[PDB]
């Protein structure tokens, strides 16, 4: 059982089995002197909360809060990536795949929001 | 068909910059680094080795070296802020020779006291380096060097300058990547990566031309330089064998405290006991010049069959032309000309104690960060003091000649104060982890 | 597609389709000088997190976290508003309605809490 | 209806009826002077957010976010406690029960993450 | 079978330390406590009674008392930071007897002014306790006591020392447990617990040997001590009936302001109207003896049939050998020798006004927290001042005798400044609530 971030080199398929270890370490003297070290510590604690909330709020609006893995209604556009489904989940790693969707990451996020928002209104709000 | 899926807690990262906080084995007497207010370090820090991972490193473009420099400067000013300011010391000083050996001067001068309506006449020795004549003639009326640019702040005698280790940690959601490749030069793709939440014990040992108490090389003498061929870039070399160096201050000074004002006093070297003795440092000649041969041959790999030559510092300020350090209370300035004085030819082989002696100078007024003004007065430590250090690195500089000869000259260059930190932080880099990831799959089955 | 807060004047039925844009903007130099501007920025960043958490925690206890629209078990009371279901959703706007339920907003929140806990208590806890 | 933390002495079974009041009080002048009182208030506000997030993030990874009560897939090991179900839920209080699981609390938390993450991977990730 | 389930919002807690913030009925003139920046208190604070709950309390090991002590000291220094520093007052003073009654001294001395190239000769009275002779000869010469250790900071006349109540609150996710047990001595298992988000109105009143304006016992005189049998531990006793104490400063001084520097002035007493009168305090003898007899018999329960004997405080500093307090602007120091002077037998019964008189001394330079230096100069309040206080507690100390006698002496000891806060915070304790709970059940049906 690898530690924190120990499965970074493993393939995409095998690296997703330990997502809990990386998700757990996202937020881990009562008095504060507000000195050189105190000021930096205060900024670090505040920055850490914002980093977690900035990443957690997206899952909430996307309808996947409290779930490590979830599927959305947005279909996969082949233009983003035309690579087979075997090599991606059995040969490639997360780092190599990150440098291929970064261009379309912002667009994918917006597509998921409008898809989830529209589906929510279509299902709920009977009248 | 295929549907897009989002994964949380994905193991990916990117280069970034963040406010790193300090962690230390907290345990009490205070120190200039103010580690008492630092976070306590864990007893068993977690370190993980990354398999199949290879990451690019660049210690020259690193941000931790720049961030640490500001923190050290900020801590230095914070420690001196509550101490007394030596504003009334700026007065005419009448000095005479002490009863070479002219390094000291028995000066006398008028001074104030707690009673604003009364004054007092006192006397105290002063190093010639921290004294400047007011006028060319009169052989008196000497003035403290810093007096016409800023008023120095006397260091609080209760705080010490012990360079205790401090660990730099990253906030949550960030990690520090460590390169474990053997003989890594600090630049390129590391073939052995590792991760750790906090760096090892970093000792802020301020030194020039010679790294003291630093980390030792693992198996071979490593050399680092952004552009080895460039003559304007400093060259950092790490040794494998720690060259022990001893220093001593045989002058037995007598501390005397004079109250300059209400609730504050000025502590000055009072009187000498015995006889005047020159401060110096020792180092084994066999163990010292032996490493030069190893360093010389290693440098030869980057410049063909050319011969390596070591010469003394070119010239300039005393802080850059001498090996500066501190024996826990007294700042020394030793001449290294006795070390970087030799020539090595391809065949040259080094083949008893015969310890080398390095004369040294001592100063009370100093500018640690080379900043205009903001000087500091170091109080004298009573009695004789001795301190041993481990020489593990050297800051070399190559002359800007045509280099078309069959030899090459190297000079111990002071470089920049940031180079001292870069010699230890080269094995680290801060990266921001992005737990959110996207990937497709044939979901909804 | 109107920008942030662009559907304020639109009717209730038409303004519920763009809730995602307003929900996304609720949380949108690393060093800090702690000066006049730095102090204000630090307070602003901390205040923003508290404002979001103060509003997000209510949905958690109510059992609606991770969702934009949700229906509770508390039945509607005509005393709060006797208007028909057509005029409110097809004619009135959110701003005009906000000045009608404010008197009963706090009471409705408490009713939803006890209603959710009782349902949780009744469904789960088999013994 | 007892006030905040009023059901501390009641039995475990009866204390679960008022979880909402305790969960609500976890996060309940705009300018800041940064003085002696201001510095303490700033630390208190930041400390409160971390306390809630540190406790809330655990429910998210465990898959129980937005739910006051939830059942995990980890079976109850008799080694932790061999007491019957009636005595614990109808005779013992939460305070007394807290001093019996404390030793196995950390182990139970770790087992829940892997139990939920494994099930999450087995259900989703069709290929 | 059974499955493990997690419950959120469970009612459990544990002892913990946290940064408590202030809360006050804010409503304006400033005060030394800087309550204007404090959070406004709620109009209807919530309090809940815990049924079937019994919690352990320890007022001696409580963290609130230690935390409050630092806050009071921090606020004290914060208020004095923007005020003028009396650095030029350290000068030779020529004094003569005012025109016992030698408590004052009409002193004269040189002083600077706004114009740096000009000086002025001024005069002002000074209490003998605030003056120290110079050279131990030439009675004319005199120096301010604090001058050789620190420069006292003059208190801003615009801020008052009124001890308005302040409520200590815990951050979200924490609570304060209050023990409602009748006659609780402060230690042991409380049989009547309650919870509240904020403590009651705590008045930061500073007093020695006698608690003023403090809480009162509900039904019986309570006694508190970590080890009653130990003679090295202070004994705190709370009264049931408040003993009103009157005080007055009959001297009618005239405030005169002299500009010591540009934009700053020093305040002192110019002259006196009428004859010199000694400051004192009054207290009913009938309502005082009584308290003792009740205190004496109560103390007898912890020492068998031994007779209780109260004696005046032992020697030492003036701050610990006298009852110190402040009538909203002037620091008093009264003898108390007239209150702890009596012997009570196992049958002794106390059985008209006959008010007792306590002579008092007044000082301007004081060290409230007994810290070296960091003194403050209290400006004189014009006109006559009077202030009444409610005596509700006493600080007693038992002599370290063999204890084999048929009696025992009790001395009013000043103890520590933290004892004043402990007398009011004994009914509170901070705990951390852990809403995450775990318990099994036959779920998944
Ligand atoms: C505000 O600031 C002003 C200006 O600084 C200051 O005025 C000066 O105060 C000092 C202290 O009081 C004065 O000092 C005295 O001055 C006279 C005059 O001295 C002159 O003349 C003599 C005689 O020719 C010369 O030797 C001398 O050099 C000067 O020219 C003297 O009478 C005083 O000396 C006596 O007192 C000294 C202090 O005790 C002794 O050390 C000394 O031995 C003398 O003792 C006296 O008593 C003895 C008996 O016990 C007797 O035997 C002696 O003969 C003698 O009578 C002293 O030096 C000074 O003059 C003032 N003026 C000036 C212009 O400096 C203010 O005092 C100050 N105000 C306040 C409130 O602080
Ligand atoms: C490179 O690394 C080496 C190894 O750490 C450093 O060497 C030490 O340097 C420190 C000063 O920085 C030396 O400290 C001083 O040592 C004195 C002698 O210690 C011996 O004797 C005392 C009793 O007299 C014993 O208690 C002690 O255990 C030793 O047996 C002490 O007397 C000094 O104490 C005074 O100063 C300190 C600091 O202000 C105060 O806390 C004390 O109260 C007291 O006033 C002091 O501890 C240390 O001895 C050196 N060790 C060796 C082996 O020589 C190098 O300095 C370092 N180089 C650089 C450049 O950083
Ligand atoms: C224990 O508790 C008692 C009761 O609170 C305290 O007694 C009071 O002490 C304060 C000082 O700490 C006294 O305050 C002063 O009272 C003066 C007289 O007040 C009467 O007269 C004025 C008009 O002259 C009326 O306005 C007032 O209502 C009264 O009828 C005032 O003249 C003083 O004014 C100064 O302070 C205030 C406040 O900062 C300023 O606004 C003014 O400008 C001025 O500077 C002042 O208010 C108070 O009178 C005492 N009350 C009694 C009944 O005696 C004890 O001090 C306290 N003991 C301890 C040790 O804490
Ligand atoms: C820098 O320069 C300063 C001077 O500018 C040097 O300081 C002086 O150094 C000399 C030599 O050390 C000191 O004088 C010596 O004092 C010894 C004291 O020993 C004891 O006997 C004394 C005898 O008392 C009578 O005589 C003295 C004066 O001689 C009077 O003051 C008394 O009132 C008596 O009448 C005692 O006073 C004393 O308490 C001892 O019991 C003495 O033995 C030597 O013969 C010699 O006189 C001189 O005092 C120093 N001055 C000061 C102010 O310190 C300084 O050392 C120089 N520094 C260096 C490094 O050279
Ligand atoms: C502490 O010690 C100081 C002195 O060291 C005391 O201060 C002095 O106290 C005396 C006595 O109170 C003051 O002198 C007195 O002043 C009274 C008021 O005088 C009124 O008439 C004067 C008439 O003017 C002419 O005469 C005066 C005096 O010669 C000249 O100054 C003028 O130029 C004129 O020629 C008015 O000037 C004055 O304003 C009044 O209206 C007077 O009745 C007395 O006979 C006596 O002279 C003296 O002025 C004080 N000095 C200062 C600087 O204040 C101080 O009180 C002592 N404190 C205590 C408590 O004892
Ligand atoms: C540090 O080592 C790296 C290799 O690990 C050196 O990188 C090579 O530098 C030469 C310079 O001409 C380039 O041509 C190569 O392409 C580089 N290789 C890689 C993999 O980057 C680097 O120069 C070394 N630095 C020094 C000065 O020693
Ligand atoms: C590193 O330094 C070398 C020189 O030591 C640079 O290479 C050339 O050096 C000659 C002089 O020897 C100059 O006239 C050229 O202008 C240099 N090249 C260029 C393109 O400027 C070299 O460029 C430097 N940098 C690197 C990345 O090697
Ligand atoms: C616990 O302490 C509380 C303190 O208020 C007691 O409260 C009682 O309150 C009622 C209603 O106001 C009064 O009539 C009673 O006199 C109070 N009792 C006492 C003893 O003062 C409560 O009774 C206490 N409980 C126990 C078991 O002692
Ligand atoms: C305060 O009261 C408690 C009881 O509420 C006292 O605790 C008892 O102390 C005696 C000392 O001999 C022990 O034998 C008992 O076992 C203690 N009981 C409990 C419940 O702890 C405590 O001593 C009292 N303190 C004072 C100073 O009177
Ligand atoms: C409380 O103080 C008593 C004494 O008043 C302590 O009991 C003994 O005290 C004598 C001196 O009177 C010491 O020599 C003994 O060593 C003490 N006994 C022990 C066992 O240390 C008592 O210990 C103190 N503490 C408590 C908790 O009662
Ligand atoms: C406590 O009371 C005693 C009573 O004797 C005081 O002692 C002395 O009293 C006699 C007679 O008045 C004087 O001659 C002595 O000078 C006093 N001094 C001492 C220390 O014996 C004692 O001073 C009183 N202590 C305090 C602090 O008031
Ligand atoms: C308290 O008891 C002690 C001891 O009995 C008393 O002091 C002794 O009194 C006798 C009287 O004859 C003297 O002989 C002794 O020398 C005294 N001291 C000692 C050590 O025994 C003391 O006076 C009593 N105090 C009061 C006033 O009751
Ligand atoms: C897929 O991507 C291409 C290229 O960007 C784009 O033209 C096309 O509209 C996209 N299709 C969908 C359905 O989003
Ligand atoms: C798997 O990845 C490796 C490394 O990039 C590559 O050489 C190989 O062709 C890949 N195989 C397939 C089937 O895509
Ligand atoms: C990656 O590392 C794993 C774990 O050791 C190993 O099984 C695998 O063969 C490695 N892959 C490559 C391409 O080196
Ligand atoms: C350093 O020492 C050498 C002798 O070892 C001497 O020739 C040279 O001038 C010195 N220069 C300095 C003080 O740097
Ligand atoms: C070594 O090489 C140098 C030239 O670099 C030459 O002058 C010398 O004679 C050689 N001597 C030996 C011992 O090989
Ligand atoms: C509806 O509102 C009325 C008026 O406030 C109130 O009396 C009644 O109890 C409410 N009914 C319910 C079911 O809440
Ligand atoms: C139950 O607890 C015991 C004692 O700690 C342990 O040995 C055993 O493995 C546990 N069983 C399971 C299924 O976790
Ligand atoms: C108080 O005690 C004294 C003895 O100290 C006694 O003489 C007196 O009668 C008692 N009562 C009164 C009213 O003073
Ligand atoms: C206090 O009064 C007593 C007499 O009762 C006396 O002996 C003592 O000296 C006085 N001391 C003080 C501090 O007033």
Region of C34 please: left (phi>0), alpha (psi -120 to 50) or beta: left
Q: How far apart are CA C70 and CA C63, in angstroms?
A: 9
What is the strand order of the sheet B21-24 is part of?
B39-40, B21-24, B167-169
C50: closest CA among E275, E215, D51?
D51
B312, B324, B412: residue to mutate for ligand 16 pocket, most atoms within 8 A of CB: B312
Closest chain D residue by Cα to residue B5: D125
The Cβ-side half-sphere exposure at E54, using a 13 Å CA radius, reads 8
Q: Which residues contact B180 (CB under 8 A, 6 or more apart)?
A: B49, B190, B192, B193, B194
Size of interface B-E (CB pairs under 8 A): 31
In the reported structure, the alpha carbon of residue E309 is separated from the centroid of ligand 12 by a whole-number distance in angstroms of 12
Phi first, then psi, for residue B437 (nearest 5°) are -140, 155
Taking contacts as CB-CB distances below 8 angstroms, the residues of chain A near B433 are: 5, 22
SS3 assignment for D18-46: HHHHHHHHHHCCCCCCCCHHHHHHHHHHH
Q: What is the dihedral of CA D70, D76, D82, D85, to 10 degrees?
A: 30
| Min distance B264 CA to chain E CA atoms (Å) | 8
The Cβ-side half-sphere exposure at B274, using a 13 Å CA radius, reads 10
**Which of E19, E20, E48 minimises the CB distance to D5?**
E48
Q: Tokens representing E374? A: 């960091």
In the reported structure, the alpha carbon of residue C76 is separated from the centroid of ligand 18 by a whole-number distance in angstroms of 10
Q: How far apart are CA B392 and CA B424, in angstroms?
A: 11
Long-range contacts for E70-77 (Cβ within 8 Å, ≥24 apart)? E71/D36, E71/D40, E71/E22, E72/E204, E72/E421, E73/E369, E74/D36, E75/D36, E75/E32, E75/E33, E75/E34, E76/E32, E76/E368, E76/E369, E77/E374
**Strands (DSSP E) found in C4-100:** none
Residue A31 touches chain E, beta carbons under 8 Å: yes
Residue D107 touches chain A, beta carbons under 8 Å: no
Q: Tokens representing B119? A: 């004054």
In the reported structure, the alpha carbon of residue E94 is separated from the centroid of ligand 5 by a whole-number distance in angstroms of 19
Bridge pairing between strands E47-49 and E193-196: antiparallel
Q: What approach was used to elucidate this structure?
A: cryo-EM
**Which of B117, B118, B262 minimises the CB distance to E150?**
B262
Q: Tokens representing C62? A: 């109510």
Q: How far apart are CA A3 and CA B48, in angstroms?
A: 6
Q: Which atom belonging to ligand 21 lies closest to the Cα atom of E338? A: 5
Q: Which residues contact D41 (CB under 8 A, 6 or more apart)?
A: D32, E21, E39
Q: How far apart are CA C49 and CA C55, in angstroms?
A: 10
- Identify the residue among A38, A71, A77 best suited for mutation to test binding to B, counting B beta carbons within 10 A and taking the highest: A71
B295: closest CA among B412, B128, B177?
B412
Q: How far apart are CA E259 and CA E261, in angstroms?
A: 6
CB-based contact D72 E5, cutoff 8 Å: yes
Q: How far apart are CA E317 and CA E280, in angstroms?
A: 20
In the reported structure, the alpha carbon of residue E256 is separated from the centroid of ligand 5 by a whole-number distance in angstroms of 15
Q: Note whether E419 and E190 are within 8 A (CB).
A: no
Taking contacts as CB-CB distances below 8 angstroms, the residues of chain D near C118 are: 17
Taking contacts as CB-CB distances below 8 angstroms, the residues of chain E near C127 are: 441-442
Q: Which atom belonging to ligand 10 lies closest to the Cα atom of E403? A: 12
Concatenating the DSSP letter of every residue in chain A gives ---TTTTSSSBHHHHGGGHHHHHHGGG---S---SHHHHHHHHHHHHHHHHHHHHHHHHHHHT-TT-SEEEEEEEPPTTT----HHHHHHT-BHHHHHHHHHHHHHHHHHHHHHHHHHHHHHHS---
Taking contacts as CB-CB distances below 8 angstroms, the residues of chain B near E87 are: 116, 261-262
Residue D125 touches chain B, beta carbons under 8 Å: yes
**Which of A53, A61, A121 minimises the CB distance to C49?**
A53
Q: Tokens representing B243? A: 């060259």
CA distances from E429 to E18, E175, E177, E204, E241 (A): 11, 8, 5, 18, 27
Q: Is the CB of B407 under 6 A from ligand 16?
A: no
Which of A 37-56 lie inside 8 A of C, CB atoms?
39, 43, 46-47, 49-50, 53-54
Residue B19 touches chain C, beta carbons under 8 Å: yes
Experimental structure resolution, Å: 3.5
Q: Tokens representing E414? A: 């000043």
Long-range contacts for A85-88 (Cβ within 8 Å, ≥24 apart)? A85/B2, A85/B440, A85/B441, A85/B442, A85/D127, A88/A12, A88/B439, A88/B440
Pocket of ligand 3 from Cβ distances under 6 Å: E 29, 160, 162-163, 205, 212-213, 325-328, 387-389
B31, B201, B328, B391: residue to mutate for ligand 2 pocket, most atoms within 8 A of CB: B328
Concatenating the DSSP letter of every residue in B379-407 gives PPPSS-EEEEEEEEEEEEEE--S---SSE
Q: Is the CB of B352 under 6 A from ligand 15?
A: no
Residue length of chain B = 445
Q: Is the CB of E342 under 6 A from ligand 20?
A: yes
| Min distance C68 CA to chain E CA atoms (Å) | 23
Indicate the DSSP class of residue E198. Answer: B
The alpha carbon of residue B27 and the mean position of all alpha carbons in its chain are separated, in whole angstroms, by: 25
């Amino acid at each position: 059982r690898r530690g924190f971030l120990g499965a970074a080199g493993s393939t995409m398929g095998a690296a997703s089995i330990t997502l809990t270890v990386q998700a757990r370490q996202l937020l881990s003297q009562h008095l504060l002197k507000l000195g050189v070290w105190g000021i930096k510590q205060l900024q670090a604690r505040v920055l850490a909360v914002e980093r977690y909330l900035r990443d957690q709020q997206l899952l909430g609006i996307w309808g996947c809060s409290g779930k490590l893995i979830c599927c959305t209604n947005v279909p996969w556009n082949s233009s983003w990536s035309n690579k087979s489904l075997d090599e991606i989940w059995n040969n490639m790693t997360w780092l190599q795949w990150d440098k291929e969707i970064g261009n379309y990451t912002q667009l994918i996020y917006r597509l998921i929001e409008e898809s989830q928002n529209q589906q929510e209104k279509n299902e709920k709000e009977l009248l | 068909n295929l549907w897009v899926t989002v994964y949380y807690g994905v193991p990916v990262w990117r280069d970034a910059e963040t406010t790193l906080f300090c962690a230390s084995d907290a345990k009490e007497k205070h120190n200039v680094w103010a580690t008492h207010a630092c976070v306590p370090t864990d007893p068993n820090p977690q370190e993980i080795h990354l398999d199949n991972v290879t990451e690019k490193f660049n210690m020259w473009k690193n941000n931790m070296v720049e961030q640490m420099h500001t923190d050290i400067i900020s801590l230095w000013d914070q420690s001196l802020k509550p101490c007394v300011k030596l504003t009334p010391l700026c007065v005419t000083l009448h000095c005479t020779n002490v009863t070479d050996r002219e390094e000291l001067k028995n000066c006398s001068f008028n001074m104030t006291t707690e009673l604003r309506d009364k004054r007092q006449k006192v006397y105290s020795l002063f190093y010639r380096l921290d004294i400047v004549p007011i006028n060319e003639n009169q052989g008196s009326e000497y003035r403290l060097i810093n007096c016409n640019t800023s008023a120095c702040t006397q260091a609080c005698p209760k705080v010490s300058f012990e360079p205790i280790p401090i660990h730099y940690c990253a906030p949550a959601g960030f990690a520090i990547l460590k390169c474990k490749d053997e003989g890594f030069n600090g630049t390129g793709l590391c073939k052995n990566v590792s991760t750790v939440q906090c760096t090892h014990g970093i000792k802020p040992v301020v030194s020039t031309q010679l790294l003291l108490n630093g980390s030792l090389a693992e198996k071979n003498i490593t050399i680092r330089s952004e552009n080895i061929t460039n003559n304007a870039k400093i060259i950092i070399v790490q040794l494998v064998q720690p060259v022990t160096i001893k220093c001593i201050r045989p002058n037995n000074y007598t501390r005397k405290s004079i109250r300059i004002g209400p609730g504050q006093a000025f502590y000055a070297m009072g009187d000498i006991i015995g006889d005047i003795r020159q401060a110096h440092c020792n180092v084994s000649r066999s163990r010292w010049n032996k490493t030069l041969q190893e360093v010389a041959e290693k440098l030869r790999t980057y410049f063909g069959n050319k011969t390596i030559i070591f010469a003394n510092s070119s010239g300039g300020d005393l802080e850059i032309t001498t090996h500066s350090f501190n024996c826990g209370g007294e700042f020394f300035y030793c001449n290294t000309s006795g070390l970087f004085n030799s020539t090595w030819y391809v065949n040259s082989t080094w083949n008893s104690n015969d310890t080398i002696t390095l004369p040294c100078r001592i100063k009370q007024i100093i500018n640690m960060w080379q900043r205009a003004g903001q000087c500091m007065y170091a109080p004298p430590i009573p009695g004789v003091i001795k301190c041993e250090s481990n020489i593990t690195g050297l800051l070399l500089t190559r002359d800007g000649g045509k280099d078309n000869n069959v030899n090459e000259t190297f000079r111990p260059g002071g470089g920049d104060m940031r180079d001292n930190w870069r010699s230890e932080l080269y094995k680290y880099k801060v990266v921001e982890i992005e737990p959110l990831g996207v990937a497709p799959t044939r979901c909804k089955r």
